[PDB]
Structure formats: structure tokens, C-alpha cells
Scaffold this active site. Sequence first.
Site, PDB file in Angstrom:
ATOM      1  N   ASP C  21      16.574  23.340  41.575  1.00  0.00           N
ATOM      2  CA  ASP C  21      16.223  22.513  42.726  1.00  0.00           C
ATOM      3  C   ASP C  21      15.702  23.413  43.854  1.00  0.00           C
ATOM      4  O   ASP C  21      16.456  24.089  44.558  1.00  0.00           O
ATOM      5  CB  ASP C  21      17.429  21.620  43.149  1.00  0.00           C
ATOM      6  CG  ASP C  21      18.315  22.245  44.243  1.00  0.00           C
ATOM      7  OD1 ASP C  21      17.810  22.407  45.378  1.00  0.00           O
ATOM      8  OD2 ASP C  21      19.510  22.556  43.980  1.00  0.00           O
ATOM      9  N   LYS C  24       9.064  23.363  43.289  1.00  0.00           N
ATOM     10  CA  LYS C  24       8.215  22.850  42.217  1.00  0.00           C
ATOM     11  C   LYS C  24       8.509  21.375  41.929  1.00  0.00           C
ATOM     12  O   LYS C  24       9.290  20.742  42.638  1.00  0.00           O
ATOM     13  CB  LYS C  24       8.402  23.699  40.952  1.00  0.00           C
ATOM     14  CG  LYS C  24       9.843  24.073  40.711  1.00  0.00           C
ATOM     15  CD  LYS C  24      10.008  24.975  39.507  1.00  0.00           C
ATOM     16  CE  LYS C  24      11.454  25.420  39.394  1.00  0.00           C
ATOM     17  NZ  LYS C  24      12.381  24.257  39.533  1.00  0.00           N
ATOM     18  N   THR C  25       7.868  20.841  40.891  1.00  0.00           N
ATOM     19  CA  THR C  25       8.016  19.436  40.478  1.00  0.00           C
ATOM     20  C   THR C  25       7.682  18.451  41.620  1.00  0.00           C
ATOM     21  O   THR C  25       7.159  17.362  41.375  1.00  0.00           O
ATOM     22  CB  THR C  25       9.454  19.126  39.944  1.00  0.00           C
ATOM     23  OG1 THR C  25       9.803  20.046  38.901  1.00  0.00           O
ATOM     24  CG2 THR C  25       9.538  17.724  39.392  1.00  0.00           C
ATOM     25  N   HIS C  65      15.044  25.458  34.901  1.00  0.00           N
ATOM     26  CA  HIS C  65      16.480  25.445  34.626  1.00  0.00           C
ATOM     27  C   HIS C  65      16.804  26.221  33.340  1.00  0.00           C
ATOM     28  O   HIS C  65      15.917  26.477  32.516  1.00  0.00           O
ATOM     29  CB  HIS C  65      16.960  23.984  34.529  1.00  0.00           C
ATOM     30  CG  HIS C  65      18.380  23.826  34.080  1.00  0.00           C
ATOM     31  ND1 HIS C  65      19.447  24.396  34.745  1.00  0.00           N
ATOM     32  CD2 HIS C  65      18.910  23.143  33.036  1.00  0.00           C
ATOM     33  CE1 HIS C  65      20.569  24.072  34.130  1.00  0.00           C
ATOM     34  NE2 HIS C  65      20.271  23.313  33.091  1.00  0.00           N
TER      35      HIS C  65
HETATM   36  N1  LIG Z   1      13.635  19.627  53.131  1.00  0.00           N
HETATM   37  C1  LIG Z   1      12.896  19.888  52.053  1.00  0.00           C
HETATM   38  N2  LIG Z   1      13.095  19.131  50.963  1.00  0.00           N
HETATM   39  C2  LIG Z   1      12.353  19.302  49.851  1.00  0.00           C
HETATM   40  C3  LIG Z   1      11.341  20.275  49.794  1.00  0.00           C
HETATM   41  N3  LIG Z   1      10.784  20.259  48.577  1.00  0.00           N
HETATM   42  C4  LIG Z   1      11.435  19.323  47.877  1.00  0.00           C
HETATM   43  N4  LIG Z   1      12.372  18.723  48.634  1.00  0.00           N
HETATM   44  C5  LIG Z   1      13.403  17.806  48.168  1.00  0.00           C
HETATM   45  O1  LIG Z   1      14.164  18.367  47.089  1.00  0.00           O
HETATM   46  C6  LIG Z   1      14.556  17.303  46.206  1.00  0.00           C
HETATM   47  C7  LIG Z   1      13.705  17.304  44.938  1.00  0.00           C
HETATM   48  O2  LIG Z   1      13.726  18.559  44.258  1.00  0.00           O
HETATM   49  P1  LIG Z   1      12.519  18.785  43.210  1.00  0.00           P
HETATM   50  O3  LIG Z   1      11.240  18.527  43.906  1.00  0.00           O
HETATM   51  O4  LIG Z   1      12.835  18.009  41.981  1.00  0.00           O
HETATM   52  O5  LIG Z   1      12.523  20.376  42.946  1.00  0.00           O
HETATM   53  P2  LIG Z   1      12.537  20.854  41.400  1.00  0.00           P
HETATM   54  O6  LIG Z   1      13.950  20.611  40.995  1.00  0.00           O
HETATM   55  O7  LIG Z   1      12.173  22.275  41.613  1.00  0.00           O
HETATM   56  O8  LIG Z   1      11.533  20.036  40.669  1.00  0.00           O
HETATM   57  C8  LIG Z   1      14.173  16.021  46.945  1.00  0.00           C
HETATM   58  O9  LIG Z   1      15.141  15.636  47.921  1.00  0.00           O
HETATM   59  C9  LIG Z   1      12.895  16.469  47.645  1.00  0.00           C
HETATM   60  O10 LIG Z   1      12.567  15.584  48.719  1.00  0.00           O
HETATM   61  C10 LIG Z   1      11.109  21.077  50.928  1.00  0.00           C
HETATM   62  O11 LIG Z   1      10.248  21.967  50.857  1.00  0.00           O
HETATM   63  N5  LIG Z   1      11.910  20.876  52.064  1.00  0.00           N
END
Ligand SMILES: Nc1nc2c(ncn2[C@@H]2O[C@H](COP(=O)(O)OP(=O)(O)O)[C@@H](O)[C@H]2O)c(=O)[nH]1
Lengths: 208, 83, 385, 99
Positions: C21, C24-25, C65
Site C-alpha cells: 500500500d 502504484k495501482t 506484495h
Molecule cells: N493521501 C494519499 N493517499 C493515497 C495516495 N495514493 C493512494 N492513496 C490512497 O491509498 C489507498 C489505495 O492504495 P493503492 O492505490 O491500492 O496502492 P497500491 O496498494 O500500491 O496499489 C487509497 O486510500 C488511496 O486513496 C497518495 O499519494 N496520498
Amino acid sequence: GRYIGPVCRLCRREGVKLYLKGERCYSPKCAMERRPYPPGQHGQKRARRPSDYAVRLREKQKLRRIYGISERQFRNLFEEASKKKGVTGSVFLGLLESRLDNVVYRLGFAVSRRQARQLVRHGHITVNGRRVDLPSYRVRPGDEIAVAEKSRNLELIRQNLEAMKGRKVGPWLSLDVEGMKGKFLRLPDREDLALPVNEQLVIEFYSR
Amino acid sequence: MVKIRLARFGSKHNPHYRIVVTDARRKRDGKYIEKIGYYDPRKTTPDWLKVDVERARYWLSVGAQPTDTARRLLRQAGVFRQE
Amino acid sequence: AKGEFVRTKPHVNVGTIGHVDHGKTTLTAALTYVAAAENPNVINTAHVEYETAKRHYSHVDCPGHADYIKNMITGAAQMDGAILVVSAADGPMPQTREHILLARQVGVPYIVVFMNKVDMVDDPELLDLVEMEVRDLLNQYEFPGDEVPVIRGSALLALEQMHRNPKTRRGENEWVDKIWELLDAIDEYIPTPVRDVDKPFLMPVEDVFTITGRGTVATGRIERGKVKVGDEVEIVGLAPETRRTVVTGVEMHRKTLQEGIAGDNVGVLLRGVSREEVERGQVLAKPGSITPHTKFEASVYVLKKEEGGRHTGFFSGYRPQFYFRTTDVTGVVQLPPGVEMVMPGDNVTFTVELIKPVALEEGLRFAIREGGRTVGAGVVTKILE
Amino acid sequence: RNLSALKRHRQSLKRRLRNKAKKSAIKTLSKKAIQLAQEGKAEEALKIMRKAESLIDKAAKGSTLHKNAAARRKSRLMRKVRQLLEAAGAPLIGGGLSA
RNA sequence: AGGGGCGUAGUUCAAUUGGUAGAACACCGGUCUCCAAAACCGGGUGUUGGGAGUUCGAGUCUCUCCGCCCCUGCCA
RNA sequence: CCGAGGGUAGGGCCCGUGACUGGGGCGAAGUCGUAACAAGGUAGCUGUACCGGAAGGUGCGGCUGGA
RNA sequence: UGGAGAGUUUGAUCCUGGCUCAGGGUGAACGCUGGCGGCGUGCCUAAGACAUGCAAGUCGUGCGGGCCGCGGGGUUUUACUCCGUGGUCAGCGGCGGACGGGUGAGUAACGCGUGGGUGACCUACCCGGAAGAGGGGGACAACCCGGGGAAACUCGGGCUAAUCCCCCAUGUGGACCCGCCCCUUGGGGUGUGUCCAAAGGGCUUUGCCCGCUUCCGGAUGGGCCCGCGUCCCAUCAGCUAGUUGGUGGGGUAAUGGCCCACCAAGGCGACGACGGGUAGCCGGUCUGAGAGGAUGGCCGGCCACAGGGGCACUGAGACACGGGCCCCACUCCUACGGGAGGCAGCAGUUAGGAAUCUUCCGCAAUGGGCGCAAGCCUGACGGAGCGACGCCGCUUGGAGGAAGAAGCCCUUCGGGGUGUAAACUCCUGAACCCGGGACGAAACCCCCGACGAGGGGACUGACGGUACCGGGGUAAUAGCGCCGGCCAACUCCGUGCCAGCAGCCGCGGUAAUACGGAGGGCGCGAGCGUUACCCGGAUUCACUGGGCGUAAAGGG
Ligand SMILES: Nc1nc2c(ncn2[C@@H]2O[C@H](COP(=O)(O)OP(=O)(O)O)[C@@H](O)[C@H]2O)c(=O)[nH]1
Ligand SMILES: C/C=C\C=C\[C@@H]1O[C@](O)([C@H](CC)C(=O)NC/C=C/C=C(\C)[C@@H](OC)[C@@H](C)[C@@H]2O[C@H](/C=C/C=C/C=C(\C)C(=O)c3c(O)cc[nH]c3=O)[C@H](O)[C@@H]2O)[C@H](O)[C@H](O)C1(C)C
Ligand SMILES: [Zn+2]
């Protein structure tokens, strides 16, 4: 396909010398002339009185091996030979004689049957004008079989057509040694074919 | 009506037709009221077309609708040449 | 109701990486909306894209992951460059090093770093202290970490002003612009390697789909050569026998492709083949080019501990998993006699027999892993069987 | 998604009414006739029956009845009526049934 | 693709206190016999599913991999 | 009025299945006997009936395929 | 114009009898292997479920408009857009979508087969014949406009044309009731009464071509009925109320309990009714000496069905595969009130299964619907693709070449064998290279002659730059089975009732022609074996063509 393999090996085995090679299988060495016996590790030992079955096989094989025909066509031709009016012995033999490549070899041209085949497979042979390349072509009455014009000057057609001066062709086939023709006057007869094959047995092989 | 067409016989790349009087509604090579001729469109045989007459005209004198090619061949065999 | 695909702009595919988390994604689910406001008109890797006004791109967002390495990898090799996303919170973490490490064992060149989660408490000497750690980390790994275009910003925040209006341009919102600094970061730096189209052909299988009404479709990136509709092809790998088929269809991102060139990520509908006959690993090439082989005398260099590798050594009869093109197998190993002393850092050659036939051609590269770490890499030499 | 054919359903419905009406007409008129021929109203009997007969053969003109279908409906009238009057009435109007 | 399981002689089942691993019934090896069966003597015969890992030793505890079962994924 | 189908109810036919139980077939070297085959050591066989670990025994009549 | 037998019960024999093999065949599948071509042929299972595209339309010479490109201004301007040509979107009318194409679920029955009946009937377009085609009236679409709706579309007001509808007349004729004559189930003639017809369209214009109306006849295609024929179980024996017959009706093109009132009490059954199971039937196909037995895939004839089920409407014909109404199950859309859908058409997906193909090209040909015609439509059809699935043809070379290389294998250590086989020498040239390159296609149509007969002219080829022909041209694939007997073909080693083989008899316990490997041999060859199923052999259900004292079999 048409066998392809040691042949003056069947010269043996069938026990009745054969010349499927022409020249050599005619010399003081047809293979037989040095082992009038069957091939194999055994070949020269006590032979069980051949089963009434074995006999016919041996007779058929003998006859069929003489031509080079595959079992398929052979039997096939034999079945045809059956329906046709008349004695199968005679008929079937006749039909075996009409085989183009056969006539090719039965009429100088080719030294061996196997060579009379390659000639027809390559085109060198011709019939009533247009050339035929099917060994199985079935020659009929009044059809002369001339060589081609692009072959006439071939090192082979020479010698093989040369052994024609003096020698006389079958009583049912003429020949213009000069202008390579020769017709098929009429279907051969039992007698004319001095063949070491007891047809009636071969027939019996196909009853069962 | 009761037409006068051709039914394809022979074989692949070898046409050979049969001039026939079938009820228009049948299949091309289905059953047929009667035969009156043949036609080898590739000629390959001195007689690639031969047809009856007394019968051709019969069906013609009773409402038998020939086809473009059918009528052609009929004609070509002196069917309509009334003299 | 399908729509063709026309070539104009060069084609390049890339993917994201970082600690679970992080960025990305979701960064992906944004970089896409950008390149979609002006054009084109309108647990498992997710092949997507975006067309900047400068180039065509295919984004591979491997779920990341742990546990998801076997899948992670097969996607890393498919790309020419990666987008290392890092957060402002915990910063560079375990699986951020791990993904980077892999990237440098897949030949993956160039890395674009984009700092996400910056929208969380602006720490003075932090978004400037974070980049420090990072660059140092890319170096503890030999990467060119010292020329990476590092841009910051809360990617997602660039989305709220997108998921309510699909017509946002550049300039506005210091976020939804903020994401054009990463575009002009990949547009630059990360090259555009030359994909040879003078070679036979080869498409390592990644995934397989059963497209309703059409049949099995094999998705993959091109190794070389080219393949259009109506070309005979062979499926080399797994299976008991190498089955031959004709390519009845080609597509680029669910859009009809008129001709596939190397580097392209294309799906292939093979004529008459069951979803049970095709599978990852195996490749699709030209009848004749390459065949299947279980044994080989490849040259290998067993990594050193101090760099992940083993710290003990294996004796002839060690069964590891070798990674070819897009998959991984297993195989017993036989040493070239007396060499029963192959330990860490060493560099030798031996025999190996995979218990599953796979395309081998002498000149092909591979890796070796056992116990959760790359124990060694190499290349193949003439086949035995 | 669709084709011609529809043009056929619409006509279908139309022609349906066209003789659906012509039909139930011949019907109510065939009834009235006998409904009197057994009354005794010989006069105003062979009058509508004369109309009925019209409507019958008229329907035959189109795809409504044709042939015996129309011919038959006729007998079972000039038979139903004729055999209802000779039950104490005598054929007044020589307009319709034959003397 | 990702979870959770089970794999011990020839077969059915124990040691789960970290200690070359045993019971039963089979089987095998001699003896007697042409050879067996019986009978008398004498034997654990096991890739503890593979391979690595911590370690003084791993069947027991880590990881990876093979086959099978189960749940859950997958329209270029 | 008829009417597809849907209900409630009761029948018939077929198939699947059930703790447990009957006998059957088959299965290199298990247990008990000794019915039969040579008046097979009480001629055998047989219908039936009673009895008995088991083959079987006995009674009544029958057969010779018993001297 | 046609008939073959063997192995196996015993110590041995004869007989009885079963089992098994040798032969054909297959919509095949499985194993090993695999080069070419031609003609065939390819979901036998889930009548399971299906994404896409396409399988039926065409006529403006039936009729009225919308719309775009243009002769050229109507009036003298962009206002009557009148008119003119070919287009073009739907509408109205018409003919065809009821044929052709799929499938075999259902059906043991007049469904089929075969022969007949109909005085008990129908038949669009096509033919020959007869007579006509005269007055008149009206509607609804389309379109303008208003309206409800997410959509599919629906409603209201109002123009309007016809080959749409209706009224009168004409009655060659026809239909119906009654009388009569012939005739014989309702057919044919006749008389009095009633009732019934119809459309104008294009030119080249008092004539033609296309249509129209009524009647008669011909054709063709059908409906209904009847005799005989058509599977297994009798452990299925009695079945039957619209049941069987009648009378009068309804109904239909028409017979009939087809349907309905009323009356009678019947009808059917061991010659197998009723019931259960299975199944589409046939021409034919396989086998067979024949008589028979098995079967019913491709082609042709008939039938039936179109997701499951019921029903009608239109029509010459359907209770209608790509038409309609409704119920049901499942598919999808939905702005949640209602919407769309049926691959057993073609090609394709998935499921099931031992298993069965291309989302191909062409209307060039033949056939079809509509058309005066041009022409349009046509996954019927013509072709190409895929699979040795079958049959047929063809190739992997031919000729030389040692008292005979090597290697392997046997060996009474001298030798024997694979073997003219190789290598080796000449030698023809499968492939492939270049060039040439079709038949299938002559009509419709155009001109001459009258648009008739006859004569001339032009267009047209999907397969294909394929077949085929000429010239060039390299030696260039071999496998599968089997070798104790039946049954063609034997030696070594390994193994030691183990491992294994096995169609029947049976092989294997330390010398195994029987296992496994090898050498060699036999059969067949792009194939060769295996499994399944049918006939044969089986005079082993015996009509041809057997039997019963003791082998099965005489009823107490
Ligand atoms: N505050 C903040 N939240 C983010 C950011 N990027 C993603 N999110 C949040 O992180 C969570 C999602 O994680 P995800 O995008 O799935 O990251 P992954 O697990 O790398 O794919 C959600 O609550 C998104 O809104 C960011 O740069 N800043
Ligand atoms: C690895 C999976 C598949 C590989 C597939 C194939 O690899 C390849 O065959 C490839 C060819 C060279 C190959 O063989 N790869 C195979 C191998 C390749 C190895 C190359 C390059 C190296 O050099 C020695 C390279 C990474 C090197 O390491 C250093 C890193 C050290 C890290 C130590 C770990 C640290 C701190 C750590 O916290 C850490 C961790 O990371 C993991 C787990 N727990 C930890 O606690 C530094 O970063 C250098 O850069 C081809 O690329 C093929 O085409 C391929 C992609 C199909
Ligand atoms: Zn010889």
C-alpha cells in the site's frame, strides 16, 4: 510403395530363381547361383512339409513378387479378374501382363521390371501418341508403345534397345527397333508366359 | 408452374446435366416428372447434348416454362423450329 | 462495434513498483485519466495504458506484495522501464527494496521515481530527506540512482478532479498537472530500445483467455519478428507434443491490430485450440525456429550471499527452479565430475534436466531460485536431449 | 434487427377485420332469416334471406369464403328456410327461393 | 494464477518431551524340495514425497518445489 | 363453452437407495468330518416328511441307472 | 457361375456341445508412424446452452409523398419550386417469405411401403378455349401539427392516391332451392325463382406488351379413405363413454363421433386387444452360396419437429424454421411501467463425449423468388480450407557392383548371416525455377427478319496464373504388426511361477521358437495394429437345413 529393397533375395526365398535386376540377375550370379536357399540366419536347414496354407502364400508371393505390384493392387486386380467372364487363371494372368511398365519390360526397352517402372514414372514411354506416366496404365488391343524423342539419344535407351537386334519379342507383340514402336497385338495366353507359377494355387489362396 | 431445367449430376469439376421436367418447387437435383435429355457443357464427347422432341414439345404444349440455358439447348436441338 | 488500431506513435510499455500500500495501482488509475482528456478521442497483474501526445504506452501494474513474486517477475521482464512509486509516510520499506532488487535481475533499465502520499503533513526536510534515502538505496543496488526524475504529489488527489469531470486539461490543479511531470519524465530519460523484426518470431505466453465466440487467445509481449493474421505458428513448451496452428487474430489492448511488431503486448487467437492446450511459459514462434529440450549445459554464475545468493553451496543433486521467458520450472543438477564443490560466488557449468519440456535454444538466458532468493543466473549451451 | 415481413402482419390484421365483419354479417343475417321463416313471415323472410344469399356469394368474391364454402352456407338456408315455411305458410315473395 | 491440506516400510498405524525411526501382519534369505506351501534358523527391507535452510541431530521447526483433494480467481 | 399450464389428492409402472439379513458365484497350498465314486465299506438314486454342526440319517412308496 | 475350415473336454477313441480363431464391413475412435495428389466424407453424445456476422426478397411499367444532385426559370427576383431524368428513405398496394436449407426429439401409427378409391375434394403462377372489362362512390397510411415515453414506439386532429375498399349495371357463364330427364353414393343436361364479376399500367398508340373478371378444360402439386406389409415382453389378458352404431345439426375444399344434442347397446381381444420398452419408414447399405441376418450415416422419396406448450390470423396453400398471441423456463436491456430473444439455416463458441472441420471466396454455373426489362436477392448451389476418416493413383530411384568391407549377430573357431544390401560407378529427375496457361459460357439482352422460325453481335469465370503443356532440375521418407499351435516366420542373452504375455489352447518354479532385449525372418506398406459394433464361419433357432431311449429334449 513397390517394395524398394534387396530383391535378389526373393530371387532366393521363393526358391525359384528370378531376375528382377535384369543384367546381373542373368549372369553366373543371380544370387541364387551361389545360395539357392532362403535368406536369414537359418536359410539352409531341414524344411517342415509346408502347410497347405504356406504353399499358396508361396505361390502368390512368387507370382506377385515377380511383378513388383503391391498386395493392394494385386488382390484388387485379382478380384476384377474374377467377375470378368472366363477362367480366372487365364484372365488374371492376362491382366497382369497389360500393366504398362510390364509391357515396357516385356518389350525390350527396360532390362528389369523395376527399370520399366522408372521409365514410365519419368515419361520416357509413350502410347498411341500421348505419353503416359502411370505404371498401372492398362494397355489394350492395337496400342503401340513408343519411346520419347528426348530420350532416344540417351545412353540407356541405346544399349537396351540394342539388345533387340536378333532377339524376338513375344507372340503377341511386334516391334520397330529402329523407330521404337511395337504394338500389343492381343492379350497374352497361359502358355506364352513361361512362368514358374502355378496360378490355380494362387487363386486358391484368395478363397480363404 | 412445371418448369424444364437441368439437374447437375457427374461430379466436382465435371458438370453433366440432365434436361428434366420437374415441378418448379422441387430441389435442383431432387425428384422429377420426367427426363428428356442431357448436356455435357464441357463437350468432351461427340454428343455433349442430346434431347427428345415429341416429348419436349409435349410439355411445351402444356405450360412448361423452359429456363434461359434450358430453352437455349432445347432450341439448339431444333425444338421450336416449326417449319 | 470493435474498432481498429492504427500505428503512428512509437510503442513502449512500462509498469509500477513499490511497497504494497503506497502509490502504484492508484497512480496508474490516474496517469490513465490524464491521457484520456484529449485523446484517444473519447493479486493479479493488470495490463492497461495511456497515450501521451508523445508516445504509446502499455502499463503493467503487478499487484505487488510478497507471495506474488512468480507473477511479479513475469511482468518485469515485459517492460523497458519501471515507475518506482514511494510514499512520504514510512518511506522506502522492505518490499520497496525487494521489487527494486528484482528489477535489477530482470535487466529492467532506467527507473522513474514518483513520490506519492505527499499530501500528508508537509515535513520541511522530509520530501527532500526522503529522496536522499531513495537515491542512496537505488545505489546500494548499482542502479543509476542519481539521475532519476523524482517528482512528488498525492496522485489520487489528481483524481477527485477527474472522477467528476473527464475533461480536465493541463495547468489547473497543482495535482492534475502534477502528474504531467511524471509523463514528461518517462517521455524523457527512459529510452525506447530497438525491437528487431528481422528475426523468426516468438511470443512468450503470459496469460491465456477463452474469448467467447472466438476461442482461445494468448496474450504476450513479442520477443522478435512479426505476426499478422493467417500465419502458421507453433506452440513450444509444456504439453507432450508441439502443436501447430494458424493465427486467426491479433489485437492491441482490445483493439484490432493489423500487424504485430516486437515489443508489442498482443493477444493471439489461435485457430482451433483449447484453453487447456496453451499456458504460460511456452512460446509461439515460426514452425521450424527453435524446438523443445529437457537437458542442457548452460554457463551459470551462482550469486554471492553478500548479494542475496546462497552462503553455503549445493552438491550435485540440487533441485531448483529455473525461469525462462515467462515462467519457471524445476530441475535436478549434475556436476562435470570432481566439481562436487560448487559454493557461493563461484562461476561454472553443468547439466540440468527439467521435468517439464520447455523451449530452449542455446543463447537464451535464465535465472535460478530456491528458498525465496535468486541463487544464480546464466545462459544456455547446446542441448543434450 | 428487423425486416420486411412486418408489412405482412399489418395487412394481416386489416384483411382480418375486412372479412371478420363480412363474416359475422352473413351470420346474423342468416339467423334473422330463419328466425322468421319458422315464424310465418314468409314475405319479409325471403327478403333478408335474399340479402343473406347476396352477402354470401359476395364474400366469395374475395379471400373470405370461395367455392362450396359459400355454396353450402346457401343450401343450409334455402333448405332451412324452405323447410321452415312449408310448415304452414306458402311462399309469398317469389323473390329468392325458386318456385 | 493465490490461500489451506495429506504424503513414514510391502501395505494399514506409532514415536509430535528437537536425539539412526520402531509394532503387527506380510515379504526376503538360507534349510528340506523339482519349485512352492508348511516347519525350523536368521534379517527392518525405508529416496521418513523432492531439495535446500537453522543448527551439536531434525521424521517433528523455516523456505522452496512435485502429485492429489478443497475454496476462491480468469473474455485479446 | 372448450382450453395450455399451475395447484390439492389418490392410484399404477419403472429406476435409484437403506441399517440389517438370505442364499449364490469366484478366490495356489485354512478348520471339521467322510455323503458319493469299487455290496465305496449301511447298493445308490428318488418324491415326501421329521430330524441332525456338516456332509447326511431315518420313515413311507417308487426306480435299476443295484447283485 | 455358386458353398473350404481350424483350436479346445480324453491316457487314447467316437459322438454331442459350448467357447475361440482365419473373411468381409464401419459417419468410426485409440497407439506408433506419416510425403503428394484426385474423388469422397466428417457431433453417431446434450433435440444441451449459445457472443458476433450472414441465411428473403424484390416491382416505381400498381399509387401518392419526403429528400439530394441537376436541364431551366415559372412571375421579370430566393413566393404557385409547376414540371424533367436517374436516383434515394420509409408508406400504401402486389407477388414471394408455406419453396429451398436444418434435424430425428416425437411417432408401433394409414407414419411409412405397396396397390388402389374419391358420385367425398382442393390446386397460386403456367397452358388451350369462351365471354367480358360500362356507371359510379369512399377510407387509411405517408406527410403537417399537438401529445405520453429511457427505449422499442404509441395516441389524437386533418389532407390525400391508386391494380385498397364499397354500391349499381351487364350474365358469355357460374352458385343455391324445388320439378324433370339421363345417370348412378354428391355426375351430367334442363327449366322457373334468387344470388355473383372486374384495374388500369407502359409504350413506339383505333395497335401491342403487362395485368384484370367469370366459366370450361389441361397440367402439376396435394387432402381424405381403403386391402396387404412393418420390432421385443404374455412375469401385460382382458380393453372401451365420444366408447360402437343411429337420426338431425355444427364444421370442412371434402368423407367422418371430427365436434354436439338425442336414441340404441354397442365395439375390440390368444389371428395377441389393452399395457410396457425401443424406434422416424423406404429406395437402399453390409454380410451371405442362397434363403436369410444386420442396418437405415452421405444421395433420393415420404413423415415429423423448429427452446418446452397451447392457439389462431393472413392466405391458392401454414395453425407457418429466420410471422403473430399467450403461459413456462432460461438470455439480455431498463430512467423499474415494460422491453428484446431462440443456430435442428451457414461459419463459430462452450458443455457433454473415445470422437466429428473455415467466423473462407463467388452468384461464374445450375436452381429459386420478384421484375416488360435492366437487374436485384439467394452461406440453395459452385468452389476453396481442415482431418490419411475412406477409397483410388503416385513417390522415397533404376542399372551395374566381392567365392562377399565394416558393425552387429550367430559359430562343432575352419565359418555362417544381414547382402547386391552398402560404399562405389554410370543413370533417369518427386520436388522445386522461369515462361506460356484453359474447358466449364451461351443464352437473357442488342441489330436483321413481325418482339414468332432462322442468321449476326457484345458482355460474363468465384475456383486460378489452379489443371494442363514447354524448358530448367537435386537421389531425394519408412513404418507398424507378427514369428509355441491355430497362422506365414528361429537363434543368443537376460530373467527364474518373478517380472510379464494371453483371442482360444495356455507360456514363466535357472538351458523359455510363448516373458523382456538383441540378430535374423514373415506380412503389409503411408500405413500398420488395437478396441467397439454387424454378417460370416454357427445345419449353433436348422424354410432352404437339426433334434428329444442313455448326450439338452416326450407333457404323469
Ligand atoms: N493521501 C494519499 N493517499 C493515497 C495516495 N495514493 C493512494 N492513496 C490512497 O491509498 C489507498 C489505495 O492504495 P493503492 O492505490 O491500492 O496502492 P497500491 O496498494 O500500491 O496499489 C487509497 O486510500 C488511496 O486513496 C497518495 O499519494 N496520498
Ligand atoms: C529473478 C526472476 C527471473 C529472471 C528471469 C530472466 O533473467 C535473466 O536471465 C537475467 C540475465 C542477466 C538473470 O539471469 N537474472 C538473475 C539475477 C541477476 C542478478 C543481478 C543482475 C545482480 O548482479 C549480481 C544485481 C541485482 C546486483 O545486485 C545487488 C543487490 C543486492 C541486494 C541485496 C539485498 C538486500 C539489501 C535486501 O534488503 C533483501 C532483498 O533484496 C531480498 C530479500 N530480502 C532482503 O533482505 C545490486 O543491486 C546489483 O545491481 C534475463 O533477464 C532473462 O531475459 C529473464 C528476465 C527471463
Ligand atoms: Zn537374381
